[PDB]
Design a protein around this ligand. Structure first.
Ligand SMILES: [Cl-]
Ligand SMILES: [Cl-]
Lengths: 131, 131, 130
């Protein structure tokens, strides 16, 4: 009987102690629920950042695509200009030769015309002297 | 004895209440385990998005390097073309002056040849009249 | 007695509850480890997003430099093109004028040879009459 009463007291105190440890586990679960709520907020902010970065990459891709198209257009324009400059080098070089040839020919014709002018003066003077 | 029997019955009750509280905590742990599983899958979907973005940035970086090189090549071609066009403006300016001078010189030679033609007619007429 | 038996059953049931409580205590410790790893993964992912953003910012500066260089090359080609069109016009006009000069000079050369012959023929004729 004395043994019974002693053990029943121990059981009262052990049941109360177990119930306090169960309340402690409930507080640990509440703290885990707060960690999970915060993790979920962080996952939402990271989702927002990933949307923002993806938009920046998409926009940058479009600007690079526009630059590749502008470079192709400038390439077409320089491709068209280069052979026109090569052609003009040939045209002006051939014109230069023809201008030099004309300057030599006109100089020769002027000298020959001046020699014929003096020949006319000489011959008319001579004929006048015989008459 | 009646006091003992009553406290043993209350302990039986309290041990059953404790076991109901333990069952409730196990259900809460099962709910947390589910949330953790879903968070771990979300960590994987975000890892996938980051892989996709990183691959887009690598590709874009290659395109930008290709464009910077294409721009330097076009720059070298325009740098080469510009002084060739400046040289052609110099050649053509100098040929323009030379062509104008030839047109004035040929006009003068034509007038002078017509004057000598007239002079030959005048002097021959005069000499014939004296004979 | 029935009391003594129930008190012993209660001892054993309280120990079974403490074992189960200790098991839930270990499961909560394991969940706390899972949370710490998840937090570490979020911190690494935040860093990766910062590193990617920095690379995109640097790449965007290079793209801006290229767009600017493209506008400068555009200005240079815009200036060249009409100068090449002008040179085609000017050289075409000079070519036409040079062919006219060559025809005129050819004509003058023939006319000068005819006047040279005429001076010889007329001087011969006059000499013959004297
Ligand atoms: Cl008891
Ligand atoms: Cl670019």
């Amino acid at each position: 009987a004395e043994e019974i009463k002693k053990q029943v007291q121990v059981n009262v105190d052990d049941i109360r102690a177990a119930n306090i440890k169960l309340d402690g586990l409930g507080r640990q679960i509440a703290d885990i629920s707060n960690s999970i709520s915060t993790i979920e907020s962080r996952l939402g902010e990271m989702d927002n950042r990933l949307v923002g970065i993806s938009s920046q990459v998409t926009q940058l891709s479009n600007s690079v695509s526009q630059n590749t198209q502008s470079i192709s257009s400038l390439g077409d324009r320089i491709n068209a200009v280069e052979p026109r400059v090569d052609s003009l080098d040939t045209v002006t070089s051939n014109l230069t030769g023809r201008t030099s040839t004309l300057e030599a020919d006109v100089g020769s014709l002027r000298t020959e015309l001046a020699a014929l002018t003096t020949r006319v003066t000489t011959e008319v003077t001579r004929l006048d002297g015989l008459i």
